[PDB]
Structure formats: C-alpha cells, structure tokens
C-alpha cells in the first residue's frame, strides 16, 4: 500500500531545566521576596545576629532548628512563611506537572485524509519521485 514517512526529533528536553523555565523573572522576584521575608523577620525579632543566622532562611528552606524565637509574633510570621513555602512548593509542583504533560508537542500526521498535510503550506515540500504509479 501507499504510506507516508517522516523524520523524527530524537531529543526532547535536557532534564536540567533551572527555575528560568518556570520564569527567570519569577526566579528573581522569588529571590527578592525571600530576602524581604528574611529582612522582615530579622526586623521583628529585635539570638539577634545568632538568631538571624538561622532563624527563618533555614526555616524557609528546611528543618534545621537553629532559630531563636523572639515573640509569638515571630511564631505567627513563621507559620505564615511556612504556608507561603508550601504554596510555592505546590505551584512548582503544578509547573512540573504541566511541563510533563506538555511534552511531545508535535503530532504525527495520520495520513493524507487528514487535511493537515493535504492543506498546502510554505513549510512542507513533501513529494514522491517523478513518473511513478502514484
């Protein structure tokens, strides 16, 4: 029978995507927001330098336990920062899920009864030999 052939794009991604694929501007804004949160925690705390060394930045990162609380206000701010971190985590989770779902963008042309390749284009010059039975 008659059938169509196509090249293939072997690579698809690099698996080494930074926060820039999310957004580089988002990465810079997130860094600025983290710096702002750390500065606000340090300002409200007044430990001191010893507290500010590992009060919230580590706490925002992971569980290190080297923070020195100053007041219940600091505890509430820390709970809020933990909620914000969880929100960012879920946001990047959905970001990675969207990238995983979005993989393989090109769609294989299922024949010429499909008008997609039947529609003439300025991009595809697909053809056969000259003077054939087709």
């Amino acid at each position: 029978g008659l059938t169509i052939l196509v090249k293939k794009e072997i690579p698809r991604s690099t698996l080494d995507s930074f926060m820039q694929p999310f957004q580089s501007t988002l990465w810079l804004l997130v860094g600025l927001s983290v710096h702002v949160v750390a500065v606000m925690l340090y300002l409200l705390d007044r430990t001191l330098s010893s507290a500010m060394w590992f009060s919230w930045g580590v706490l925002l990162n992971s569980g290190i336990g080297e923070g020195a609380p100053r007041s219940f206000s600091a505890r509430i701010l820390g709970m809020v920062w933990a909620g914000f971190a969880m929100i960012i985590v879920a946001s990047y989770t959905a970001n990675l899920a969207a990238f995983l779902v979005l993989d393989r963008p090109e769609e294989r042309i299922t024949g010429i009864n499909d008008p997609r390749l039947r529609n003439p284009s300025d991009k595809f010059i697909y053809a056969t030999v000259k003077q054939s039975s087709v």
């Binding site: 991604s13 690099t14 698996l15 080494d16 930074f18």
Partner: protein, 41 residues
C-alpha cells in the same frame, strides 16, 4: 528476505554536577577568609 531484524537519568545531573563542583571548590577559600576575619576581630 523481507524481514529479519526488528527495532530520572544523567541528563539532569550534568548541571547539578557542575554547580556542586563549583560550590565545593570555593569552600576552602571562604572558610579561610572567615577564619582570617575572626582572627582580625
């Protein structure tokens, strides 16, 4: 004749390796600078 033959990885690790090596290499100089600052103060 017609038919006889039939036809979470390291890709994520190159940049991570480069960044880890860069961070590890410069740690000694930073620790030396911190020790010098502590000694001078």
């Amino acid at each position: 004749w017609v038919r006889y033959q039939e036809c979470l990885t390291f890709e994520n690790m190159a940049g991570v390796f480069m960044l880890v090596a860069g961070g590890i290499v410069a740690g000694i100089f930073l620790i030396f600078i911190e020790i010098a600052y502590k000694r001078h103060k």
